[PDB]
Design an enzyme around this catalytic site. Structure first.
Site, mmCIF file in Angstrom:
data_model
loop_
_atom_site.group_PDB
_atom_site.id
_atom_site.type_symbol
_atom_site.label_atom_id
_atom_site.label_comp_id
_atom_site.label_asym_id
_atom_site.label_seq_id
_atom_site.Cartn_x
_atom_site.Cartn_y
_atom_site.Cartn_z
ATOM 1 N N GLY A 176 0.723 -1.167 0.082
ATOM 2 C CA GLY A 176 -0.182 -0.147 0.112
ATOM 3 C C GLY A 176 0.761 1.433 -0.145
ATOM 4 N N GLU A 204 -1.155 6.268 -13.377
ATOM 5 C CA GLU A 204 -2.120 5.622 -13.828
ATOM 6 C C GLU A 204 -3.362 6.323 -13.321
ATOM 7 O OE1 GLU A 204 -2.744 1.794 -11.325
ATOM 8 O OE2 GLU A 204 -1.661 0.813 -13.408
ATOM 9 N N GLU A 221 -4.040 -9.249 -9.779
ATOM 10 C CA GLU A 221 -5.107 -8.170 -9.195
ATOM 11 C C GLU A 221 -5.643 -7.394 -10.276
ATOM 12 O OE1 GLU A 221 -2.545 -6.912 -5.895
ATOM 13 O OE2 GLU A 221 -4.012 -7.749 -4.561
ATOM 14 N N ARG A 251 3.156 -15.321 -5.782
ATOM 15 C CA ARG A 251 3.300 -15.954 -4.454
ATOM 16 C C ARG A 251 1.983 -16.365 -3.936
ATOM 17 N NH1 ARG A 251 0.896 -12.464 -0.907
ATOM 18 N NH2 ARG A 251 1.146 -10.014 -1.331
HETATM 19 N N1 LIG Z 1 -5.479 3.092 -10.485
HETATM 20 C C1 LIG Z 1 -5.881 3.023 -9.379
HETATM 21 N N2 LIG Z 1 -7.347 3.529 -9.176
HETATM 22 C C2 LIG Z 1 -7.884 3.371 -7.781
HETATM 23 N N3 LIG Z 1 -7.159 2.557 -6.798
HETATM 24 C C3 LIG Z 1 -6.131 1.924 -7.014
HETATM 25 C C4 LIG Z 1 -5.271 2.190 -8.358
HETATM 26 N N4 LIG Z 1 -4.226 1.668 -8.208
HETATM 27 C C5 LIG Z 1 -4.048 0.939 -6.828
HETATM 28 N N5 LIG Z 1 -5.286 1.264 -6.151
HETATM 29 C C6 LIG Z 1 -5.578 0.919 -4.780
HETATM 30 O O1 LIG Z 1 -4.465 0.530 -4.047
HETATM 31 C C7 LIG Z 1 -4.550 -1.079 -3.878
HETATM 32 C C8 LIG Z 1 -3.282 -1.437 -3.871
HETATM 33 O O2 LIG Z 1 -2.827 -1.373 -5.282
HETATM 34 P P1 LIG Z 1 -1.414 -2.268 -5.669
HETATM 35 O O3 LIG Z 1 -0.752 -1.717 -7.151
HETATM 36 O O4 LIG Z 1 -2.107 -3.509 -5.669
HETATM 37 O O5 LIG Z 1 -0.351 -1.783 -4.630
HETATM 38 P P2 LIG Z 1 0.476 -2.812 -3.689
HETATM 39 O O6 LIG Z 1 1.385 -3.265 -4.363
HETATM 40 O O7 LIG Z 1 1.033 -1.805 -2.769
HETATM 41 O O8 LIG Z 1 -0.503 -3.918 -3.205
HETATM 42 C C9 LIG Z 1 -5.672 -1.365 -4.725
HETATM 43 O O9 LIG Z 1 -6.266 -2.575 -4.198
HETATM 44 C C10 LIG Z 1 -6.416 -0.232 -4.793
HETATM 45 O O10 LIG Z 1 -7.504 -0.263 -3.996
HETATM 46 CL CL LIG Z 2 4.071 -18.704 -1.514
HETATM 47 MG MG LIG Z 3 -1.617 -5.408 -4.736
#
Ligand SMILES: Nc1ncnc2c1ncn2[C@@H]1O[C@H](COP(=O)(O)OP(=O)(O)O)[C@@H](O)[C@H]1O
Ligand SMILES: [Cl-]
Ligand SMILES: [Mg+2]
Ligand SMILES: Nc1ncnc2c1ncn2[C@@H]1O[C@H](COP(=O)(O)OP(=O)(O)O)[C@@H](O)[C@H]1O
Ligand SMILES: [Cl-]
Ligand SMILES: [Cl-]
Ligand SMILES: [Cl-]
Ligand SMILES: [Cs+]
Ligand SMILES: [Cs+]
Ligand SMILES: [Mg+2]
Ligand code: NA
Ligand code: NA
Ligand code: NA
Ligand code: NA
Lengths: 446, 446
Positions: free
Chosen positions: B166, B201, B276, B292
């Site tokens: 996060g 993004e 995801e 993982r």
């Molecule tokens: N482009 C986006 N728009 C809105 N929310 C986002 C976006 N990217 C990430 N998030 C929020 O952050 C969370 C984690 O994003 P993620 O890219 O998986 O980061 P991490 O590598 O920290 O898990 C997502 O589940 C979403 O709730």
């Molecule tokens: Cl694993």
């Molecule tokens: Mg993630």
């Protein structure tokens, strides 16, 4: 639905009753001895009443105190659980005469089936097969006594009519031992049950303990929820229970099941109850009825989908049975291992402090217990400290899961039967299934 | 089958891995920091190696020590669990270069998908839909930076390519905030991930977090095991996970699932992994792959019957996939609540001694934890102290069961999110289902 109930018990069964109440939205009242003040079920209940000091006679067997707890909290019903006062007819009638619903059979049914001699008489009358025996109490006429024995065939067993928990039973191999065996069973029974009525029963040398779960609404409907095999025993007490009973056919289940359902109707049975049978050479023989929920109710729940405690509560509320006979289906297999902290020399609860505790998890693994790391096990009550129940799609899967679950279980600081349970699960004869009631004692050299 | 493995983790995941090893008859080696000497997983493992002092950098992130533990015990494989070194490509290659099987993807795949920028590039190439964005790292040309924003449409989010958990993310509402937002994300990323590459993004304002579980044997076979909805989040971290995702049709599942399975093949993916997605207005948009096992793997297991950790072990052993795509069926519904002991002011693990602990039970209730009454929670690792997962025949049943299970759970002495979890279960908007990723923060006034 009942607005509020008193849970007149402790431990696993109180936890299970509380869980059922929560799902049904029933307010709960926990009674406790002063020693059980901080038990999980007390903490979780909406209201709590201390009903006396630690000794059961002063607390959990204290009828006026339990009724008082119901009156001061304004409860509408009392669940006796198992053990304690659950098969005490005096308790049942006092509860109902004080204006509360007793979550169990009518008092007269508890009396009828609570006297083992009269229970057998009623079963024969009802068309339920019973063990050949004296069919009435034993007198002092040693000629008629030896004649009954000859008529039924040695070996025979002398049984306390007021007996329970495995106590007040003696096997007799020949005429030479009969008189004295009868004498010390009566003495044993006076001391333990304040009742020295005994009867004679043929001692079955190759039976399985197969028991039928019933529910009856007391409004003319009665169903059987398959069976349990509880043949793994020591000193007449169950160590392992399973459902369904290995090798029991749909035909055998239906045969004995329908006879139990009809007996319920004939005796005006109400609530959950269990008919216990010895099954030998393809024949069922009634030994007794437990007029209450049983410890091992979850294995039946696992294989049928029926929550037996929820159904006790709906019946007590006045609802007719919510399940028809043809809706009862057997799926998969379940095995329960009782976890006990018993002194192996005296057969009494072993007190001690639990120094390290970890419950097993994983799919199909259910653990029920009030214990926790740092818990001091009191000597006042029974020796069971938890119930481990595993489900599998078949019996081999259930046993394998149980074995793994038992090896995940950690209970340090007190003596337990965990090692014994693992050895039973690893027993080739048990794994093939259908071992009789005499197997464990012989295995253990008792 | 692998003869012996090192479990290079702690806590719930180490317990889950140990359980899987036991069922498969794999000898286990537990590594621990000096602080985790008496953890349940250490006690239960066949062998144990202390791999360093309490701090993760000195122990669970200590690559040479973990490899040493494998060599001295003669293990054949190492399971990284999740967190820690599980997505560390250096660890993966050292493990395999030292002659051990890494239970996970090839190192090059961890690098490919571990750089979020390059992961997106590969996904687009593979035919997996991605969020509109910069499609490459952000430079310092503030004209092209604002142009990318105009092309994708404000709001936008600045994301650390090396980011995780996060952290290293900033929303930008307009041109006026862009330059500085980019600047402090880079700074945040340098400090946390030792990598200040960021990308842009489109910030999706009404998406659900819907992720696809895959398994691939690295021999050309790859399956998807339905999806999970993990939209209940705070500070970009998941609080509640469920499966299947409410309202997702067989058509939508198949659409995105087959694209994920094909991507696995294109990238030579091996083992368990999760794609995801953000799902908005009927469209899936890839955000990242977790290469993982994930925390929330049991909800998928509950609805599919597939034990994902067992399958990790079979794949690592060289077995092709034991499951075909058409054999994957969705039955019932499962909900997981993470139980955390986090300081609400600093967002760090909250240390303290657990004074009273009781886990919930009952049908369909699964609890996974290393905690126990008298346990001192260390500040060294993460804030999760347990996982509560409930199954139901449908979503309403699963949620109702979870609510009851949470009210049975007792954890005293330390601050937890149990009360929050109960409130989420009681939330009408959650009960209707399909709430987006922004709901919990707004509910909580964050
Ligand atoms: N482009 C986006 N728009 C809105 N929310 C986002 C976006 N990217 C990430 N998030 C929020 O952050 C969370 C984690 O994003 P993620 O890219 O998986 O980061 P991490 O590598 O920290 O898990 C997502 O589940 C979403 O709730
Ligand atoms: Cl694993
Ligand atoms: Mg993630
Ligand atoms: N007639 C018998 N023959 C062989 N074993 C018996 C007989 N009666 C009782 N037992 C053994 O004792 C156990 C308990 O008998 P039961 O009558 O149910 O007594 P209790 O009331 O103490 O439970 C049975 O499960 C069985 O193993
Ligand atoms: Cl009862
Ligand atoms: Cl046998
Ligand atoms: Cl909604
Ligand atoms: Cs009885
Ligand atoms: Cs990643
Ligand atoms: Mg009995
Ligand atoms: Na005890
Ligand atoms: Na153990
Ligand atoms: Na912690
Ligand atoms: Na509670």
């Amino acid at each position: 639905m009942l607005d509020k109930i008193v849970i007149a018990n402790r431990g696993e069964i109180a936890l299970e009753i509380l869980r059922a109440c929560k799902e049904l939205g029933i307010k709960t009242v926990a009674v406790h001895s002063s020693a059980d003040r901080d038990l999980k079920h007390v903490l979780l209940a909406d209201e709590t009443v201390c009903i006396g000091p630690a000794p059961s006679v002063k607390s959990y067997l204290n009828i006026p105190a339990i009724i008082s707890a119901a009156e001061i909290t304004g409860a509408v019903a009392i669940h006796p659980g198992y053990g304690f006062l659950s098969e005490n007819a005096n308790f049942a009638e006092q509860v109902e005469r004080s204006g509360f619903i007793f979550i169990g059979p009518k008092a007269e049914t508890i009396r009828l089936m609570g006297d083992k001699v009269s229970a057998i008489a009623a079963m024969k009358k009802a068309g339920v097969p019973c063990v050949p025996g004296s069919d009435g109490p034993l007198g002092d006429d040693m000629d008629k006594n030896r004649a009954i024995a000859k008529r039924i065939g040695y070996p025979v067993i002398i049984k306390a009519s007021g007996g329970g928990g495995g106590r007040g039973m003696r096997v007799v191999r020949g005429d030479a031992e009969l008189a004295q065996s009868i004498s010390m069973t009566r003495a044993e029974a006076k001391a333990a049950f304040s009742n020295d009525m005994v009867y004679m029963e043929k001692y079955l040398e190759n039976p399985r303990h197969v028991e039928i779960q019933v529910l009856a609404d007391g409004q003319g409907n009665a169903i059987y929820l398959a069976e349990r095999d509880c043949s793994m025993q020591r000193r007449h007490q169950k160590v392992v229970e399973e459902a369904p009973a290995p090798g029991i056919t749909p035909e055998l289940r239906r045969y004995i099941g329908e006879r139990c359902a009809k007996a319920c109707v004939d005796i005006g049975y109400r609530g959950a109850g269990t008919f216990e049978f010895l099954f030998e050479n393809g024949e069922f023989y009634f030994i007794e009825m437990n007029t209450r929920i049983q410890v091992e109710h979850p294995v039946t729940e696992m294989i049928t989908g029926v929550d037996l405690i929820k159904e006790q509560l709906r019946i007590a509320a006045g609802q007719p049975l919510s399940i028809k006979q043809e809706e009862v289906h057997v799926r998969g297999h379940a095995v329960e291992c009782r976890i006990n902290a018993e002194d192996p020399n005296t057969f009494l609860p072993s007190p001690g402090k639990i120094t390290r505790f970890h419950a097993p998890g994983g799919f199909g693994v259910r653990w029920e217990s009030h214990i926790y790391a740092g818990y001091t096990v009191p000597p006042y009550y029974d020796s069971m400290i938890g119930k481990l129940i595993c489900y599998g799609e078949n019996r081999d899967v259930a046993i394998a899961r149980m074995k793994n679950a038992l090896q995940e279980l950690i209970i340090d600081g007190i003596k337990t039967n965990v090692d014994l349970q693992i050895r039973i699960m690893n027993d080739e004869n048990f794994q093939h299934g259908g071992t009789n009631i005499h197997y464990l004692e012989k295995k253990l050299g008792l």
